[PDB]
Symmetry: D2
């Protein structure tokens, strides 16, 4: 079924995770056709500034994510940054996420694949759509069986990303495809007004799921504040993409 | 508002070709009454990569052929001009004067089109940023144009490749009606060396994206037998596929429409 | 011999052309090894704004350019924008320039070639280096024998141009190559600090000449004010590129 | 200031390969006394496109081989790390710890390198703008790095292609010493599908441009027989050509030097 990966960018506190987790649980009950996966990073290991927020550590993070899964029965997903983190994270994460800058780091991919969990790789901003075939092969070699590739924009000049929707059908040849609606519009080192329009395009073109960072009060978020979707708008967007998908799916090309 | 579908053979290979395509477009205009069809075909391909490529049979022949299409089918007409002097003669038959992408910044060409009183559709140059079309529209308004369209046809992305930045649709909508060019956006500039390439497999998915995001019309080149086309043989849509594509975009437009943002 | 195309961007007045023409004449006498060509546009036909400066017309322009050639004995070059302008412009222009946005307009190229004059085509920001082979072929077909291709940057994301120096050796396979030092650093719809550094790169790589817009008081220029080189700095830069060329030429690759 | 030339085989195919290249680099260091040579070779290619490509013989073997080069020739050493734990063991032999381009934003890796007390050279990511390296240097300084280098190795330009924006040299010079990577800048990422491509014919012209613009050093991978290399066979410079290239860049640097702008 259609996948919806959502949650606050960073684990600012399990308190925050619970609030967002409650709303995602609610939507989960309203849209039984959709498979929801709660997402939040225990560490923002690639911030531009040394003075920016990273998180409260892996242990506190994994603990908070456990609280969400136990309290709401929602599947979990978080990203790893070094090989050693794969095992401990797999304890709670149903889907292990591979950062875009790290999509070519063989040992990280293998470490993730070895856990037995599903692996979602953010397509690097430097990668061409067809270059992801090799990424999937690394994971299959590592024992991975449920593999996802996420479209999150491609480097377009300086401090800008463009979404080449031709990537969706191309990547679909070797993996399930997820569209990252929030990072695709950010301006490296974004514009919220483009989030909805592009997510509509993604489902019209055809994908297997969408990824969206959401926060009760984006303006106060400690990470990606300019692009996180306000929690209150999540239901509306999900219903919208389901209706568009329903009509458009008739025309999705085979493989 | 009425959705615009601009379609026809890339080049006026012959008046016969035009009438064959026109017949089908007329049939579709009778079916899709919520669509305003405009028949398109260039009397001259003034910017081919190679000097040996097909250009056309001249302005005179071209206007005559287009007039026949309008006369026989009652279809609105659009064609592109390449130099200022062509605006006057073309305006006699063209309901919409089209400005080529490479020439979207040539002030006199824009002014020549604007003063004819006809609608003007400017292809956004592959070098232009979305927000920079504001001045293009300003020039047209300054020149007297009352109905203006901006067409998204891709942006230079590395060499011999174009990418469609759909953020351009809501941006350009701020100052003009927006049209999505479904066939030129997937072409590979200078791809085959002496000629440009293209990937037909992406025409349909990208047009679905265009209407989901929201535009005021689509532009599609269509030919009975693309493989035999004298220009853009790699991107022209088979004529038999036109009807299905249009129905599909009207369906996606309808369901997405309630979510189109207000500019 | 090494070509140096220089002059004010636009013909703001023949008065201005004479002042700049006097300095170019002087340098012409100081650097006998270099072939100087005076440049200035009679019309800026592609300004972004309808309210910007275009010029005083073709007649006034061609007249002013005549005054420079007659008074200083300097070769001339200006750009054309429509086919009909080729003939009248050829009366004074030794080199007919084809605008970057118009490098694929067949009739403009043919019209220029028909005049018998040399033709310099600005490589479009949308063109790949190898795509210029076809441009040269159009000119040869039109009777052109002295053909130049000018590097002026390539579209790199929005409102930015990058100079891919790989273009110099590539374009050299079918035409003499000129490097446009002033338009290559401008930001479409620039940065003067990069003019000298990149012109040094151009000669180190290897080219047949350089193109530089110069004005006595750039800040007051009616066109490309942010990138026009101050007249007083022209001599220094020319001497610099000659010294670099002298040493580097030993390593220029054959064809 | 003394010009830096970082050179060596892309990967530590064998200790034998290292000694053969090291011998030549040592010979050149005796000739070009105004140059500070640093021998480079990766103990692991941790980011190959294909799982079937050569990676290396492990950290242990690698450090041992590099130590032999430093021991036999008295040459400074540099190699790249891929995860934080590798900084400590590598620092035992590496005079300069190199940070891979894809990892230029991984805070812990940068910090791990900085605290070793060794110099740190960061390859500018293909996704990074020149002005955004300011924060990269800030992180290193924060972590205790006292000698920092930023290496220009090209920027993503469309798919499977990189372009070198030489404006990056004077920009990055504002906060660190700048190195130009003459061999990676001409490679075509994922060019051959399972592996990356490259155009050797552009290595020399672009390095001439680098020194004309002005940098503090150059980085060049060299191999006795590039065609047999287990990594970057399309871009590694034949070892016999190294001497000529270095003489040429020193000559161009000298004549251009008086014109280098003051940051
Ligand atoms: O095939 P070549 O001659 O490159 O021409 C490209 C065509 O696709 C051309 O007529 C196009 O739309 C013009 O810009
Ligand atoms: O040949 P593939 O495996 O693509 O690897 C690219 C190499 O050029 C690679 O080791 C490179 O410099 C790493 O980024």
């Amino acid at each position: 079924k259609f996948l919806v990966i959502a949650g606050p960018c960073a684990i600012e506190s399990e308190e925050l995770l619970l609030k967002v987790g409650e709303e995602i649980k609610r939507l989960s009950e309203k849209f039984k056709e959709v498979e929801f996966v709660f997402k939040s990073s225990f560490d923002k290991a690639n911030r531009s500034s040394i003075h920016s927020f990273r998180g409260h550590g892996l242990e506190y993070g994994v603990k908070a994510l456990r609280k969400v899964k136990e309290e709401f029965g929602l599947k979990i997903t978080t990203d790893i940054h070094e090989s050693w983190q794969a095992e401990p994270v797999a304890e709670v994460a149903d889907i292990i996420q591979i950062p875009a800058f790290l999509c070519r780091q063989t040992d990280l991919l293998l470490a993730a694949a070895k856990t037995g969990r599903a692996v979602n790789v953010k397509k690097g901003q430097f990668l061409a759509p067809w270059d992801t075939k090799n990424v999937v092969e690394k994971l299959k070699f590592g024992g991975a069986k449920e593999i996802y590739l996420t479209e999150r924009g491609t480097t377009f000049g300086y401090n800008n990303l463009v979404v080449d929707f031709r990537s969706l059908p191309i990547m679909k040849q070797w993996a399930k495809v997820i569209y990252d609606a929030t990072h695709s519009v950010q301006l490296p080192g974004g514009m919220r007004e483009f989030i909805f329009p592009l997510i509509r395009a993604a489902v019209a073109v055809g994908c297997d799921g969408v990824f969206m960072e959401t926060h009760p009060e984006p303006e106060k978020a400690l990470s990606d504040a300019s692009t996180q979707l306000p929690l209150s708008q999540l239901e509306g967007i999900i219903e919208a993409i389901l209706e568009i998908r329903e009509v458009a799916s008739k025309y999705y090309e085979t493989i």
